[PDB]
Amino acid sequence: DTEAPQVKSGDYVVYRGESFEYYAEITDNSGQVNRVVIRNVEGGANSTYLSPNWVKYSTENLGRPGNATVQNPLRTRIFGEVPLNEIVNKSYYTRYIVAWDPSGNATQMVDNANRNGLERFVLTVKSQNEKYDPAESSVTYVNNLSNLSTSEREAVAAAVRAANPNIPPTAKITVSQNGTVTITYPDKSTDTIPANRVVKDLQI
Ligand SMILES: CC(=O)N[C@@H]1[C@@H](O)[C@H](O[C@@H]2O[C@H](CO)[C@H](O)[C@H](O[C@]3(C(=O)O)C[C@H](O)[C@@H](NC(C)=O)[C@H]([C@H](O)[C@H](O)CO)O3)[C@H]2O)[C@@H](CO)O[C@H]1O
Ligand code: NA
Ligand code: NA
Ligand code: NA
């Protein structure tokens, strides 16, 4: 056996202030995989260094016959919690999944984007706003679109909240005097909703 384990990963996008969890699938022609490391490219054959330190991983059922077949691949959990203080611009971390078969053949690390989604993957860190796609709210009819009262601003925010149960509970929804909506996430990134997607009046 001189064929290394083959890996299928994916496009692993993660977001500040949020947990993430992805699975990679690993097969070997022998049907068995004994070890899995996720690592930075540098450091040579024995390195297990992986950064950022909040990237965790685990593999169940290692070292058992038939644990890594085409019909039932071995799976490695890749998971963690992204801190609020990560720098984003998106930020990118290209990483490698190395698996070993019983003969000691290890998946090779090849530095080319054409291998992305195989043993090589890109972990993309985005701001928290990018995880959400604020939904179409129920229109709030106000007296005058150029001057919402406090009660009208609160009504618009409540309609947006009711239409968006998946946004973080501690995100803050605010509405301006012309009905423009701002959603401020825990990581302090924002989404905006133009007024005429949420408010109308009967002045015409
Ligand atoms: C084999 C070896 O030791 N050579 C290293 C050389 O590999 C290393 O280059 C790194 O190569 C990897 C792919 O193998 C990436 O291309 C690294 O580029 C990026 C990345 O995608 O990982 C770009 C990205 O924009 C960077 N992110 C941020 C937030 O800055 C990351 C990031 O700096 C690193 O991932 C942190 O570990 O790097 C590329 O750097 C170079 C430089 O380390 O050194 C050779 O000797
Ligand atoms: Na093999
Ligand atoms: Na499986
Ligand atoms: Na968004």
Numbering used by the authors: 245 to 333, 335 to 449
Question: What text appears in the publication on this structure?
Answer:
Many streptococci adhere to protein-attached carbohydrates expressed on cell surfaces using Siglec-like binding regions (SLBRs).
For SLBRHsa, this included structures from crystals soaked with the high-affinity ligands sTa and sLeC, the intermediate-affinity ligand 3’sLn, and the low-affinity ligand 6S-sLeX. The resolution ranged from 1.3 Å to 2.4 Å and the diffraction quality loosely correlated with ligand affinity. Instead, comparing costructure determined with sTa with the costructure determined with sLeC shows that the position of the EF loop differs by 5.9 Å. In the strong and intermediate ligands, the invariant Neu5Acα2-3 Gal effectively superimposes and has similar hydrogen bonds.
